[PDB]
Ligand binder design. Structure first.
Ligand SMILES: CCCCCCCC/C=C\CCCCCCCC(=O)OC[C@H](O)CO
Ligand SMILES: CCCCCCCC/C=C\CCCCCCCC(=O)OC[C@H](O)CO
Ligand SMILES: CCCCCCCC/C=C\CCCCCCCC(=O)OC[C@H](O)CO
Ligand SMILES: CCCCCCCC/C=C\CCCCCCCC(=O)OC[C@H](O)CO
Ligand SMILES: CCCCCC/C=C\CCCCCCCC(=O)OC[C@@H](O)CO
Ligand SMILES: *C/C=C(C)/C=C/C=C(C)/C=C/C1=C(C)CCCC1(C)C
Ligand SMILES: CCCCCCCCCCCCCCCCCCCC
Ligand SMILES: CCCCCCCCCCCCCCCCCCCC
Ligand SMILES: CCCCCCCCCCCCCCCCCCCC
Ligand SMILES: CCCCCCCCCCCCCCCCCCCC
Ligand SMILES: CCCCCCCCCCCCCCCCCCCC
Ligand SMILES: CCCCCCCCCCCCCCCCCCCC
Ligand code: NA
Length: 224
């Protein structure tokens, strides 16, 4: 109990600092080509609002814990993970498009394909929820959930990446981190939840800090 709590406190700490940074980021002036970065950052802040609600719920609920509350995380992830996938698409498009591009152009052109990505991701989460609540066995959950995780990342890769190291870094770092949520599913209650608490720092908050630094680097002459 103490270690789930302490890791949640660490995760909260990084959330609060990150959110402050992200807010200032929204007001940094941007050149035409960089506007999509602010579009990304406001979606990451929305993700933060949801995440924070779950973590306050968690630390309160952990005071008197009798039930395995792990499943409640899925009510967060079903809202946050599609947003994160959209923002990943937008960042790849930003990195890889020669001309400036904004989210409206991407959404209007690709909404069907984006729905397929989010649908695959939804099936991954549904299978995990069934496993986490013990409606299917662990082995089926890991093979079915991993199948959909792969499919989601394959769809991402083949439409949105280019073959270069700045793509490989963004793509594989994320793919590995998301795969580690499946790895955590294997473990007993306390270890599993400690691993989700820290993984959320990496999968959400580090991404926001990354975007902030990209913004500050692109725009620092407009600031100074
Ligand atoms: C001035 C603003 C500081 C914001 C927070 C950044 C600095 C954080 C202080 C270091 C910290 O949190 O340390 C944890 C502790 O040392 C682990 O055992
Ligand atoms: C710790 C987090 C603070 C980090 C702030 C960075 C740049 C702030 C830029 C503020 C932009 C205001 C509008 C402007 O400068 O124009
Ligand atoms: C609208 C339909 C929504 C169905 C909801 C969840 C899928 C349940 C799938 C069946 C799971 C039963 C347990 C099992 O697979 O054993
Ligand atoms: C089970 C569901 C289907 C999987 C097949 C894989 C579908 C792969 C679709 C790839 C589409 C693609 O290449 O999109 C970018 C152009
Ligand atoms: C235009 C600049 C592009 C430079 C890209 C490579 C440069 C530096 C490395 C940045 C630090 C790691 C990448 C953060 C973005 C990312 O993958 O986070 C996913 C993470 O949340 C886990 O899911
Ligand atoms: C901010 C929260 C995030 C990014 C949560 C992500 C969760 C996953 C990628 C879950 C993955 C799973 C597997 C890979 C297999 C089946 C079990 C899951 C759902 C835990
Ligand atoms: C002993 C049980 C409780 C442990 C609490 C601390 C556990 C987590 C330690 C690391 C937390 C920060 C993780 C940062 C990201 C990991 C590496 C990212 C590379 C880019
Ligand atoms: C807006 C909020 C989105 C969902 C946040 C994550 C879940 C927080 C708890 C919801 C209630 C679950 C109670 C189960 C015992
Ligand atoms: C009290 C309100 C809790 C809200 C939790 C999240 C709601 C969306 C859950 C969707 C589940 C089915 C995909
Ligand atoms: C549990 C429910 C999952 C199994 C039934 C649906 C199978 C997935 C089919 C669509 C996946 C997402 C779209 C991929 C093709 C572009
Ligand atoms: C990418 C960061 C993942 C961090 C995993 C932390 C594992 C801690 C396990 C609980 C302590 C026993
Ligand atoms: C915590 C992650 C920081 C990553 C900074 C990357 C900035 C790249 C700018 C080009
Ligand atoms: Na459970």
């Amino acid at each position: 109990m103490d270690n789930i709590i302490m890791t949640a406190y660490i995760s909260i700490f990084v959330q609060i600092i990150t959110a402050i940074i992200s807010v200032y980021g929204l007001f940094i002036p941007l050149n035409f080509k960089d506007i999509i970065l602010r579009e990304i950052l406001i979606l990451e802040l929305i993700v933060q609002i949801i995440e924070f609600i779950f973590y306050i719920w968690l630390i309160i609920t952990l005071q008197s814990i009798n039930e395995d509350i792990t499943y409640v995380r899925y009510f967060d992830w079903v809202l946050t993970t599609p947003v994160m996938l959209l923002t990943t698409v937008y960042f790849f498009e930003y990195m890889n498009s020669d001309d400036g591009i904004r989210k409206k152009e991407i959404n209007d052109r690709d909404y069907v394909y984006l729905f397929y990505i989010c649908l695959s991701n939804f099936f991954m989460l549904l299978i995990g929820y069934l496993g986490e609540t013990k409606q299917i066995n662990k082995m089926l959950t890991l093979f079915g959930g991993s199948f959909f995780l792969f499919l989601t990342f394959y769809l991402l890769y083949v439409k949105y990446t280019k073959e270069n190291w700045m793509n490989y870094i963004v793509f594989y770092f994320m793919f590995l981190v998301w795969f580690l949520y499946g790895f955590a599913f294997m473990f007993p209650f306390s270890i599993k939840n400690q691993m989700y608490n820290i993984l959320d720092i990496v999968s959400k908050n580090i991404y926001s800090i990354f975007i902030f630094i990209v913004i500050l680097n692109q725009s620092y002459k407009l600031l100074l």
